[PDB]
Amino acid sequence: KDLASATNYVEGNARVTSGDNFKHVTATTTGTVTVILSQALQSNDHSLLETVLNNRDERVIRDTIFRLKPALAVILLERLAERIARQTHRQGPLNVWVKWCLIIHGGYLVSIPNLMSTLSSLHSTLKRRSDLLPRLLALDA
């Protein structure tokens, strides 16, 4: 090419991200599905993760998360943040599952030291889904 020819900008295969990925730093309740969820989260099981959360009865969700262990509740939040990051039409019945496990396991994930870092997928999911609010406020105005 010429020597007076200016070099054109090209992105190539460069990684684009945001300033919000902080990836570094006797029975009497219901017959629920929580052993399904715990042995889904011990493995990484998308098929029976989807069969344990296509159910959207809110009280079965509630006592499912209550009967769930605290040690894998955080990784439940991670899987939920990933999938509502991917499918935006899944934000309806699945932020139910995230507004409960924040509520139900209150002390465990306020004792965990970097909630923003270990749930930066959730940080980035909500910050992206909620930073564009004033634009569509102006739109529907």
Partner: protein
């Protein structure tokens, strides 16, 4: 350049051992050791020894005495080994090493023949050096360095009789002319106020510094450029600086001549024969976080006045960018006279403090950037006005309009005037979060709440705010929320801060439902006002008329 200061033989071991370090003791027969216990037999003691080492196994140690040679001692099984003599004066400072590392017939007089670590091991006699008063062993490429008051300096390695360097270095009889922390240089600690680190590879001085305080016996530790030094007429032992992966905290080196501080670790509790208490608990020399603690070796602070770009044909200023004044001339003798002018007979008036300070700061009394000042002077004159006399109108209004108040701000809640406290909010550029919080939660339902919320939300970081407003009662936040419901924006986000700091569970029901009702009406009206802000052909047969 000091360090974290407090507390006022195998030398790399720890406790739980029987006897890892043996030393000669004053006013006894010869010697002893310490525990955390073994035998201390006769290794041909009872001489005029003062210094001690071992053969680096704790099984074949040596009682280095005035015999000109030594033997192997018995403190592990009892069984002795065989010996030999080379020199014949005093082996009282012998340093026995590992398997052919550094061992030579250095008795007292510069007659060291080369040898090795066995009973009859020997080699070619390198006694052609000077009778040096500072002869020592180092381990860079294992060597002996010898500097003399016959003035001389030399360096010869104990590997192949490898004499590498030799010159004349005229060091005096200083306090400690000992090798440094990494051993590349030799710190000669001079007696009274001085210590010079000289580069021990070419006989050249590298840093001749002064000393900070009094100190007698020092020891360079396992550090970069750091030693620990204790005083002669005191038990004061500080640390100075000019293993590097996980720092050496205790029992790396020991030489101490204070009040019997022998075997000096950080916890130097288990002394040789003393069995006394301990002291400081630091690590070794870290990277750069010891700098604000050890801000010593110069305590000569004074008042720096504002200098200039100095005048040489400085009448050619060429449209100076100032407003109207051309040169502010600093009269600091007049400012020191204004201190004595403020210390005068206006005990409740404003003619011998107020107009005096307004005349020594000549402006419109509500404006800064007419600066000719010093913060220490201003703190002193602020105390001379907060002494015998806050009724002043000019000086104590024109200088809490000053960015340098230096924590004289504690009674800004204790004084309660309308205008002086409103100015103390909106102007005083140091006003801590404790009293901001108390004036935030001592509501009489006024606008000083709004102006103090603006200050606490513009001046401090949210984590420092929230860990401090942990420390509040419940009824102050209850009358706060009842105020916000009954009788606003920074207040809204400060309600968010208060609610985040209040904790997670232990709240009440009707108060939360009250805030819920209020906050949902706030959301609906915020939606509609943001909506307001964002909210700002022919037919085939007609019939008209024409004019007549």
């Amino acid at each position: 350049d000091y360090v974290q200061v407090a507390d006022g033989l195998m030398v790399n071991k720890g406790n739980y051992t029987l006897n890892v370090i043996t030393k000669a003791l004053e006013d006894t027969t010869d010697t002893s050791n310490d525990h955390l216990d073994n035998k201390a037999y006769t290794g041909s003691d009872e001489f005029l020894s003062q210094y001690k080492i071992k053969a680096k196994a704790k099984v074949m140690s040596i009682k280095i005495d005035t015999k000109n040679s030594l033997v192997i001692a018995i403190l592990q099984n009892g069984l002795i080994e065989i010996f030999d003599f080379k020199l014949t004066l005093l082996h009282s400072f012998d340093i026995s090493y590992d398997n052919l590392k550094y061992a030579k017939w250095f008795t007292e007089n510069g007659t060291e023949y080369v040898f090795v670590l066995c009973p009859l091991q020997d080699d070619k006699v390198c006694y052609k050096l000077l009778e040096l008063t500072d002869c020592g062993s180092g381990e860079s490429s294992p060597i002996k360095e010898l500097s003399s008051t016959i003035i001389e300096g030399f360096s010869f390695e104990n590997s192949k009789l490898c004499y590498q360097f030799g010159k004349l270095y005229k060091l005096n009889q200083g306090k400690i002319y000992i090798y440094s922390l990494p051993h590349c240089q030799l710190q000669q600690v001079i007696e009274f106020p001085m210590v010079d680190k000289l580069s021990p590879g070419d006989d050249l001085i590298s840093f001749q510094p002064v000393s900070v305080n009094r100190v007698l016996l020092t020891v360079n530790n396992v550090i970069y450029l750091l030693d620990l030094l204790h005083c002669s007429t005191l038990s004061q032992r500080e640390l100075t600086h000019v293993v590097i992966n996980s720092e050496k905290s205790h029992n790396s080196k020991t030489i101490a001549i204070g009040i019997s501080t022998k075997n000096g670790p950080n916890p130097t509790s288990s002394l040789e024969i003393i069995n006394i208490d301990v002291g400081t608990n630091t690590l070794k020399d870290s990277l750069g976080k010891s700098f604000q603690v050890g801000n010593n070796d110069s305590s000569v602070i004074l008042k720096p006045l504002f200098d200039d770009k100095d005048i040489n044909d400085k009448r050619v200023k060429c449209n100076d960018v100032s407003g109207d004044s051309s040169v502010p001339v600093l009269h600091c003798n007049e400012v020191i006279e204004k201190l004595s002018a403020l210390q005068d007979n206006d005990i409740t008036s404003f003619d011998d403090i107020f107009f005096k300070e307004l005349k020594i700061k000549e402006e419109h009394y509500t404006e800064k950037d007419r600066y000719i000042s010093d913060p220490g002077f201003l703190n002193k004159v602020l105390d001379l006005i907060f002494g015998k006399f806050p009724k002043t109108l000019t000086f104590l209004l024109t200088h809490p309009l000053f960015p340098l108040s230096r924590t004289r701000n504690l009674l800004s809640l204790l004084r309660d005037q309308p205008r002086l406290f409103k100015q103390a909010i909106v102007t005083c550029p140091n006003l801590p979060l404790n009293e901001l919080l108390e004036e935030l939660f001592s509501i009489r339902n006024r606008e000083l709440l709004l102006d103090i919320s603006f200050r606490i939300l513009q001046d401090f970081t949210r984590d420092s705010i929230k860990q401090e407003m942990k420390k509040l009662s419940k009824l102050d936040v209850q009358n706060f929320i009842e105020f916000i419901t009954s009788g606003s924006t920074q207040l809204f986000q400060l309600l968010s801060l208060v609610l985040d700091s209040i904790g997670l569970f232990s709240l009440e029901g009707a108060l939360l439902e009250n805030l819920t009702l209020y906050i949902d009406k706030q959301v609906e009206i915020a939606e509609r006002n943001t909506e307001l802000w964002n909210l700002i052909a022919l037919p085939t047969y007609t019939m008209e008329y024409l004019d007549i």
